[PDB]
C-alpha cells in the first residue's frame, strides 16, 4: 500500500542514471554523434590531451551521480553518460512544485572541457522552444545556464567553481535551488528591491504567467510529442504517472491567471490552448511497462 509519491519515486529511481551511445568512433578514430548535443564542436575539436588525472576525476564525477541524484515527486534529476567518453553527458531535471516550472521536464547538455577540473563543466539548457523562451533571468534564450558555481554569474569567491571541492552533483542541485524557483522574476539583479511592492507583485505575476504557459508547451507538450531518445522512457513514465496531477495543476494555473491586465489575458489564453493539447497527449499515452 504505497502512496502515489512513493510509487512515483520507486519507478523513477531506476531511470536516474545510465549510459547511452551518444557517439561512435571511426576507423580513423573520428567521433560521429548519434544524438543532438550542444558541444559537438568542442568534442570534435578537443585536440584531446588524454589526461589521466582528468579521467580519474571524471570517473569520480560519474560515481557520485550514479548514487546521489535528487529524487522526489516535486523535483528529480536524471543523467545519461556516453558509454565510452567520460566528458559527455545529458541531464533532465523536472520542475519543482510551487514554481512556474512544476512538473515540466527540462533538458540540459553537459561538456567537461579539456581543462576540467581547473575550469568548470559547460552546461546548456536545451529546452528553450528553439530559443523562443527566456525561462529565467539565469536561463538565456540561447540556453546559457548562469550560476556562480559555473562561473557564469557573479558571487563571492567561495561561491565560484572550486577545482578541489566543487562537483557536478553540486551544480545540478544549484539549478534546483537557485534557478528553478518560485517568483523567478526577482532573480534579475536589482529587481529584488521591488519585492513586496504592488508594482513588484504585478511584474512577478506577469513573469510567472509567461513561464507557466512556456512550461506546459515546451517542457510538457513538446517533450511528450518529441522526446530526446536519451529520456524517452523517463518522459513517458513521468507524464503518465503524474497525468491527473498535471491536469489539476494546469487548471489551477488557469484559474489563478484569470483573476487578473491585457497581458495576463494573453498568457491565460496561450495556457488554455496548450492545456487542451496536453490533455489529448496525456489520454493518448500508452501504459508504460515497467510499473510492476
UniProtKB/Swiss-Prot annotation:
Active site residues according to the UniProt entry: 146 (glycyl thioester intermediate)
How this protein is processed and modified after translation, per its record? Ubiquitinated; mediated by RNF41 E3 ligase and leads to proteasomal degradation, impairing inhibition of apoptosis. Deubiquitinated by USP8/UBPY. Autoubiquitinated; mediated by E1 ubiquitin activating enzyme UBA6. Proteolytically cleaved. Acts as substrate for CASP3, CASP6, CASP7, CASP9 and HTRA2.
Residues in UBC core domain copies? 53-220
Kindly list the places in or outside the cell where this protein is found, as annotated in its UniProt entry.
Golgi apparatus, trans-Golgi network membrane; Endosome; Cytoplasm, Cytoskeleton, Spindle pole; Cytoplasm, Cytoskeleton, Microtubule organizing center, Centrosome
Known tissue expression? Expressed in brain cancer cells.
Where are its TM segments located? none
Instruction: List each coiled-coil range.
Output: none
Q: What is known of its domains?
A: The BIR domain is essential for its anti-apoptotic function and is important for binding to DIABLO/SMAC and caspases.
Function recorded in the entry: Anti-apoptotic protein known as inhibitor of apoptosis (IAP) which can regulate cell death by controlling caspases and by acting as an E3 ubiquitin-protein ligase. Unlike most IAPs, does not contain a RING domain and it is not a RING-type E3 ligase. Instead acts as a dual E2/E3 enzyme that combines ubiquitin conjugating (E2) and ubiquitin ligase (E3) activities in a single polypeptide. Ubiquitination is mediated by a non-canonical E1 ubiquitin activating enzyme UBA6.
Its family?
Answer: Belongs to the BIRC6 family.
- SUBUNIT field: Homodimer; antiparallel. Interacts with RNF41. Interacts with DIABLO/SMAC, likely with higher affinity to SMAC dimer than SMAC monomer; this interaction blocks the substrate-binding site and inhibits the caspase inhibition activity of BIRC6. Interacts with KIF23/MKLP1, USP8/UBPY, BIRC5/survivin, MAP2K1/MEK1, RAB8A/RAB8, RAB11A/RAB11, PLK1, EXOC3/SEC6 and EXOC4/SEC8.
Q: What protein name is recorded for this chain?
A: Dual E2 ubiquitin-conjugating enzyme/E3 ubiquitin-protein ligase BIRC6
Origin species: Homo sapiens (Human)
What is the primary gene name for this protein? BIRC6
Question: Entire protein: which part is shown?
Answer: 4521 to 4818 of 4857
Amino acid at each position: 500500500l504505497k502512496s502515489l509519491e512513493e510509487k512515483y519515486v520507486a519507478v523513477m529511481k531506476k531511470l536516474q542514471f545510465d549510459t547511452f551511445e551518444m557517439v561512435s568512433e571511426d576507423e580513423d578514430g573520428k567521433l560521429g554523434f548519434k544524438v543532438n548535443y550542444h558541444y559537438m564542436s568542442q568534442v570534435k575539436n578537443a585536440n584531446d590531451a588524454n589526461s589521466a588525472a582528468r579521467a580519474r576525476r571524471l570517473a569520480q564525477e560519474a560515481v557520485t551521480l550514479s548514487t546521489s541524484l535528487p529524487l522526489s515527486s516535486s523535483s528529480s534529476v536524471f543523467v545519461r553518460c556516453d558509454e565510452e567518453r567520460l566528458d559527455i553527458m545529458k541531464v533532465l531535471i523536472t520542475g519543482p512544485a510551487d514554481t512556474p516550472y512544476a512538473n515540466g521536464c527540462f533538458e540540459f547538455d553537459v561538456y567537461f572541457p579539456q581543462d576540467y577540473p581547473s575550469s568548470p563543466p559547460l552546461v546548456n539548457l536545451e529546452t528553450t522552444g528553439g530559443h523562443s523562451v527566456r525561462f529565467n533571468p539565469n536561463l538565456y534564450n540561447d540556453g546559457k545556464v548562469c550560476l556562480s558555481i559555473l562561473n557564469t554569474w557573479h558571487g563571492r569567491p567561495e561561491e565560484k567553481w572550486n577545482p578541489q571541492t566543487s562537483s557536478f552533483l553540486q551544480v545540478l542541485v544549484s539549478v534546483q535551488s537557485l534557478i528553478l524557483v518560485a517568483e523567478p522574476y526577482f532573480n534579475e539583479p536589482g529587481y529584488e528591491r521591488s519585492r513586496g511592492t504592488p508594482s513588484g507583485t504585478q511584474s512577478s505575476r506577469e513573469y510567472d504567467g509567461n513561464i507557466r504557459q512556456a512550461t506546459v508547451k515546451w517542457a510538457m507538450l513538446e517533450q511528450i510529442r518529441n522526446p530526446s531518445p536519451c529520456f524517452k522512457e523517463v518522459i513517458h513514465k513521468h507524464f503518465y504517472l503524474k497525468r491527473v496531477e498535471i491536469m489539476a495543476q494546469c487548471e489551477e494555473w488557469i484559474a489563478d491567471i484569470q483573476q487578473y491586465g491585457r497581458t495576463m489575458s494573453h498568457h491565460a489564453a496561450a495556457l488554455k490552448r496548450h492545456t487542451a493539447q496536453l490533455r489529448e497527449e496525456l489520454l493518448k499515452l500508452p501504459c508504460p511497462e515497467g510499473l510492476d
